[PDB]
Amino acid sequence: GKIVGIIGGMGPVATVKFIEKLTSMTDAEIDQDHVRYVLYNDPEIPDRIEAYFENMESPVNAINNGIKYLESIGIDTIGMACNTAHIWFKEFVYKSNFLNMIDLTASVLKKSGFKNVLLLSTNATVSSGIYTGKLRDYNINTVIPDQDIVMKSIHYVKVNDTKMARETIEPVINGHRNEVDALLLACTEMPVIISEKTYNIPVIDSDEALAAALIKSAGKRLKKEYRLYDL
Amino acid sequence: GKIVGIIGGMGPVATVKFIEKLTSMTDAEIDQDHVRYVLYNDPEIPDRIEAYFENMESPVNAINNGIKYLESIGIDTIGMACTAHIWFKEFVYKSNFLNMIDLTASVLKKSGNVLLLPVIDSDEALAAALIKSAGKRLKKEYRLYDL
């Protein structure tokens, strides 16, 4: 019954969905079989797109304070529910096992056998090539959608206008159907409005890759429908 | 804004629902205008009164530990949703530990002999209180909860 640590707030709407998913992925008869966690939810962590492209405040210092507070009660597994913030992964300061969502997600993708995927992520995640670097040695066709449209959809999710976010991303998805075999959800806002049943296209969800790792580290059980994520 | 503290985990689904309510009640056009909090979610704190009486147990230690932890972060206000509220008078705290029942009662008498669940949500009363203490803004559609 180990307590795990979660860093969230990036953004708040996506974090709620992340915690919901973590709960729903857990195989629990009784309430005590669910994950014990401390969520450090700091939405005043500086905007990660402005940090990356516009020389504004890096999220590193705020994230590091969260890690420090989680580690102060002996939490030794922490996950951060934000793809884009992993651009700064080497600058985080931690003593614990700070999970890497990009690695876990890439490992899931490599295991799955999917050869052609639609990368749905922020523009910083695309530009930084953080997924490109991890997949380059694995022979996987990664298709980049229109970044203006995807970023518009992400913004709508962020203000919990899920209706406009769906309407916005729909033609992007449907337009790429013929050249991808799966959707790679690599922005935590995307799972708020997209699952496999949404478009009837397989999904590799970075939320679920991280959640599965946290569930395992918490000593809990993963539901078998999420077998793909059992790394 | 100030970081605030939340104790939850009893049960896990209700906790997610509470934090979703907190988020959707906050008036914010950008992420950085939302509420900063630390949520201590412990599903191993028993949810049934039968369990406590049977095993000569009490959630006082688990809640008090959570409180010490949140306070060690520098948190000045802590809210708990929920069965552990039965032991509210025995919790040990330095900070302001909000009482969900009094927040609820005062919302009622502020603009209004109630049917125990024209809709008042006990969750939203606590949420409103936490949003205020976090130095954040409450969406107008929740006027009724603004203490």
Side-chain angles (χ1 to χ4, degrees):
Chain A
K2 13 194 180 162
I3 298 161
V4 295
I6 300 170
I7 300 175
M10 299 176 281
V13 178
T15 304
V16 172
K17 178 63 182 187
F18 178 80
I19 299 295
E20 181 202 287
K21 182 85 84 188
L22 175 76
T23 300
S24 80
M25 293 172 64
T26 301
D27 197 349
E29 266 169 62
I30 59 185
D31 269 346
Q32 288 176 352
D33 290 338
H34 274 287
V35 175
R36 310 168 76 194
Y37 63 86
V38 174
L39 168 63
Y40 188 93
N41 187 312
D42 190 356
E44 298 193 6
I45 289 164
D47 191 280
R48 300 145 290 282
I49 312 303
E50 289 176 5
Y52 189 72
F53 289 112
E54 296 300 326
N55 298 307
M56 306 308 296
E57 194 193 341
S58 165
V60 169
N61 183 76
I63 287 165
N64 278 341
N65 288 339
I67 295 171
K68 167 226 157 177
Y69 278 129
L70 294 176
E71 289 181 343
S72 65
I73 39 158
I75 289 170
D76 205 82
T77 295
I78 298 167
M80 173 177 68
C82 178
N83 286 265
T84 306
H86 285 77
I87 286 166
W88 295 268
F89 195 80
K90 281 300 187 157
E91 307 181 34
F92 300 142
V93 162
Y94 56 86
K95 305 163 186 161
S96 56
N97 183 15
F98 194 78
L99 301 171
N100 185 311
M101 178 175 36
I102 316 299
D103 292 336
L104 294 161
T105 299
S107 290
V108 167
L109 179 52
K110 173 195 184 175
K111 186 181 172 207
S112 71
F114 286 116
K115 286 171 175 40
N116 308 287
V117 307
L118 187 66
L119 175 58
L120 293 165
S121 73
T122 63
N123 52 4
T125 289
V126 166
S127 294
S128 72
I130 54 176
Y131 275 94
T132 313
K134 296 320 167 65
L135 302 183
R136 156 181 296 122
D137 294 335
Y138 302 179
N139 218 22
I140 282 153
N141 168 39
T142 313
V143 177
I144 312 302
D146 183 308
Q147 299 292 278
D148 296 310
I149 307 185
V150 176
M151 286 303 287
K152 185 181 312 183
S153 185
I154 295 170
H155 283 212
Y156 279 132
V157 177
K158 276 187 180 299
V159 295
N160 198 37
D161 187 354
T162 48
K163 177 33 183 48
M164 279 315 104
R166 293 174 183 274
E167 176 181 314
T168 301
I169 202 59
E170 174 86 30
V172 174
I173 311 303
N174 291 333
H176 289 281
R177 277 187 185 258
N178 156 76
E179 59 160 337
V180 305
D181 300 318
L183 309 179
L184 173 55
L185 308 189
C187 166
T188 57
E189 273 85 26
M190 289 288 93
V192 183
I193 62 169
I194 297 174
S195 66
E196 183 178 1
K197 55 174 203 39
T198 306
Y199 300 100
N200 217 323
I201 299 172
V203 179
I204 298 87
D205 182 353
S206 63
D207 268 27
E208 299 184 358
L210 182 59
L214 288 165
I215 287 163
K216 178 159 216 190
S217 291
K220 297 314 174 183
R221 295 211 53 66
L222 183 65
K223 285 184 188 171
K224 58 191 183 223
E225 77 188 289
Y226 294 103
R227 70 181 83 263
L228 182 52
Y229 296 91
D230 209 318
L231 295 171
Chain B
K2 299 189 240 63
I3 304 166
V4 297
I6 305 165
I7 297 173
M10 312 149 294
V13 172
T15 288
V16 179
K17 286 295 188 153
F18 176 71
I19 63 170
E20 181 183 79
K21 295 182 190 175
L22 182 74
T23 309
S24 64
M25 284 171 67
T26 308
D27 183 14
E29 274 189 55
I30 56 172
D31 293 345
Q32 290 70 29
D33 286 334
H34 279 277
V35 170
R36 311 171 81 210
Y37 63 88
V38 178
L39 162 60
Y40 161 60
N41 187 100
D42 203 339
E44 303 195 8
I45 312 175
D47 293 35
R48 320 155 79 222
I49 183 58
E50 316 183 337
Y52 288 120
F53 202 77
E54 258 287 307
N55 296 130
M56 299 174 286
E57 259 323 286
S58 147
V60 163
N61 285 351
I63 296 294
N64 280 349
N65 285 350
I67 289 172
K68 285 180 180 64
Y69 173 60
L70 300 174
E71 287 174 351
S72 77
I73 297 180
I75 293 169
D76 287 329
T77 312
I78 300 169
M80 180 173 58
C82 277
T83 184
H85 275 285
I86 289 173
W87 283 264
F88 184 85
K89 288 186 285 144
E90 306 167 41
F91 300 153
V92 174
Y93 48 85
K94 301 197 60 195
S95 46
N96 183 7
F97 197 120
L98 301 166
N99 191 339
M100 189 173 185
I101 325 189
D102 304 88
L103 288 170
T104 302
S106 311
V107 166
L108 293 178
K109 82 190 178 230
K110 199 54 213 92
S111 284
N113 42 37
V114 80
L115 179 63
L116 179 51
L117 307 63
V119 296
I120 313 298
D121 189 339
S122 184
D123 267 13
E124 294 186 346
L126 183 61
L130 283 164
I131 291 166
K132 189 171 223 309
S133 60
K136 299 299 170 137
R137 306 184 307 266
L138 178 64
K139 276 185 191 177
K140 264 324 188 175
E141 78 211 23
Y142 300 96
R143 339 263 206 287
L144 167 154
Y145 294 96
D146 210 344
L147 59 81

